[PDB]
């Protein structure tokens, strides 16, 4: 590509978003366990949130 | 006697002399024009118009609307059954223990 310097910041932003989504799964020790939002699982659903 | 052999102080440069259509970004006219276009596109057409549109349509900031609507329910509860609008105690007096005095 003749404009390869213009895809450094957007790729970095996509990488940061992906790392945020990856880090959110490691902090799921209380997913569907809170006293305010606990709920029986709906059909065709295995987690409350990703 | 000539202390400190030094280049003379250069005169000021006028960007309008060599290019009367200079926007003030660069002395090269094409680079100056492209910098002007980039600044005016990503400074007004992207981060101001779309930014103000995003800020204007924020989805219920700090639930400031919701706390009204729930209150619109809650009064309609306690006015219907003769209850007072607000109690003087935030917590129930039956479930709180005081030290002896």
């Amino acid at each position: 590509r003749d404009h390869w310097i213009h895809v450094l910041v957007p790729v970095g932003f996509v990488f940061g978003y992906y790392l945020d989504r990856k880090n959110d799964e490691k902090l799921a020790a209380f997913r569907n366990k809170s006293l305010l939002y606990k709920r029986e699982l709906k059909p065709q659903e295995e987690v409350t949130w990703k | 006697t000539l202390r400190w052999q030094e280049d003379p102080e250069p005169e000021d440069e006028n960007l309008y002399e060599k290019n009367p259509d200079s926007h003030g970004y660069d002395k090269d006219p094409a680079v100056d024009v492209w910098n002007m276009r980039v600044v005016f596109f990503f400074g007004f057409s992207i981060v101001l118009v779309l930014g103000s549109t995003f800020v204007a349509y924020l989805p219920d900031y700090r639930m400031q609307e919701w706390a009204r609507r729930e209150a619109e329910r809650l009064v309609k509860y306690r006015e219907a059954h003769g209850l007072p609008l607000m109690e003087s105690n935030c917590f129930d007096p039956s479930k709180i223990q005081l030290p002896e005095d």
């Binding site: 450094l8 | 309008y16 003030g24 600044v39 900031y61």
Partner: protein
């Protein structure tokens, strides 16, 4: 907060692998894109703050400062690309890398959930600022300005760290989310007295406080335009943010402790406004106005009422934008007349009409004309300090008059009257300068429509 740190760090391969003269265009474009993506931090809830991970979290207080910083970086690059046109390419890349690094440390300071991490970034902002001031300044006194700026701040911040470490040995943790639930009342004793002094004097120094403000007129008027912007609009708010975070642990000893600093700021606003009434330098006038406004923010934080906190954060954002605009105006005049004297270039309305309009608008927002957010913040601080005591309004009200006595004066001597006869290098206003002032002012005028996003974490 990893989605904002990574593009900011990737800005350095952008500015080092760019072309011979395409560094400014690429850096401005990608920093404006980062500023556009910065608006995703407005996911605020009425009870819960936005917590990202074990290290980074964003309340409704840090979010306007983050947005202001990431908005200020492209404006900074636009402002500092005229006096560096004669610079070396390597030195230009070094300057851009310094600005990028400073912005990275600033956006990592505000989101720190740990007070030690916050303190580390809060001192890490010192090195690029000092390097910029001492290297890319114009006068000799910048070297002196490199000392008073430095050894003041550390003299406030080196005891404070010890106090912070003491909390690590007392409460078991320094996480702000934990400390909101494990806080304890502070009894009246000499130990808690000196711990309060250690935890506060760094933020009084970096705000600044009257008496300790001596570094600010020196580090504002020798610094270049980018340094003046970074001191005026962001780096004076680190003290306010640190105060708002650290006042939680220092209760209820603050009620009788805040008296001498409140009196110092309430007299220092009058003293600095009177100094502004007789200053011969534009840059020193803007610096002393910044001192007065930050003394007002100090009073607002110290009386610690919800209206005071709201007025404090609104005043912080509004003063940052207004001081940045005033410093860019002073930089444009300095670049056109090659001097800093107020009385030198007079009657510029007959030569620059649009710059006269920008000067009038900036002076209008300086004296807090309603319904701008300057008036919102100053008004709410006035209401809170009238609730605190019924006499302080006098010490407010007189100050207001003196504000309207210098800002318009700063207009008149620079805009009205007969033009000087021996100055004939007054060029017309460039498109870059007008773009800079419009980008400074239009968010400030637009924020009056929806001010609820800059009203603190207890709105």
């Amino acid at each position: 907060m990893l989605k904002y740190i990574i593009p900011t760090m990737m800005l350095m391969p952008l500015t080092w692998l760019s072309k011979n003269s395409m560094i400014w265009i690429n850096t401005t474009l990608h920093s404006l894109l980062i500023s556009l993506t910065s608006l995703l931090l407005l996911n605020q809830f009425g009870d819960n703050s936005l917590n990202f991970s074990l290290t980074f979290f964003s309340d409704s207080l840090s979010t306007p400062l983050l947005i202001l910083t990431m908005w200020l970086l492209p404006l900074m690059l636009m402002a500092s690309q005229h006096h560096l046109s004669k610079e070396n390419l390597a030195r230009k890349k070094l300057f851009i890398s310094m600005l990028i690094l400073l912005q990275l440390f600033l956006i990592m300071t505000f989101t720190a959930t740990e007070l030690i991490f916050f303190y580390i970034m809060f001192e890490a902002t010192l090195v690029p600022t000092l390097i910029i001031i001492t290297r890319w300044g114009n006068q000799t006194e910048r070297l002196n300005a490199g000392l008073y700026f430095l050894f003041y701040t550390l003299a406030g911040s080196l005891p404070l760290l010890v106090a912070l470490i003491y909390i690590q040995n007392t409460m078991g943790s320094l996480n702000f989310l934990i400390l909101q639930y494990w806080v304890q009342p502070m009894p009246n004793s000499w130990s808690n007295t000196f711990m309060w002094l250690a935890c506060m004097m760094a933020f009084m120094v970096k705000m600044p406080l009257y008496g300790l403000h001596l570094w600010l007129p020196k580090a504002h008027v020798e610094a270049p335009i980018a340094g003046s912007m970074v001191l005026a609009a962001i780096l004076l708010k680190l003290g306010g943010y640190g105060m708002m975070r650290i006042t939680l642990l220092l209760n209820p000893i603050t009620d009788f402790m805040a008296y001498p600093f409140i009196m110092l700021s309430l007299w220092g606003m009058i003293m600095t406004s009177s100094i502004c009434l007789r200053q011969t330098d534009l840059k020193s006038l803007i610096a002393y106005s910044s001192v007065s406004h930050m003394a007002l923010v100090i009073v607002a934080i110290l009386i610690q009422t919800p209206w005071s906190y709201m007025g404090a954060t609104a005043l912080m954002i509004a003063h940052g934008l207004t001081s940045s605009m005033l410093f860019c105006l002073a930089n444009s005049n300095y670049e056109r007349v090659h001097s800093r004297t107020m009385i030198l270039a007079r009657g510029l309305q007959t030569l620059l009409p649009l710059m006269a309009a920008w000067w009038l608008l900036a002076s209008l927002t300086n004296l807090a004309l309603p319904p701008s957010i300057n008036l919102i913040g100053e008004l709410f601080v006035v209401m809170s300090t009238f609730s605190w005591s019924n006499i302080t309004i006098i010490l407010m009200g007189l100050n207001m008059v003196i504000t309207a006595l210098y800002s318009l004066y700063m207009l008149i001597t620079t805009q009205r009257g007969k033009h000087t006869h021996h100055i004939n290098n007054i060029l017309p206003s460039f498109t870059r300068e007008n773009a800079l002032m419009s980008l400074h002012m239009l968010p400030l005028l637009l924020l009056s429509l929806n001010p609820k996003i800059i009203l603190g974490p207890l709105y």
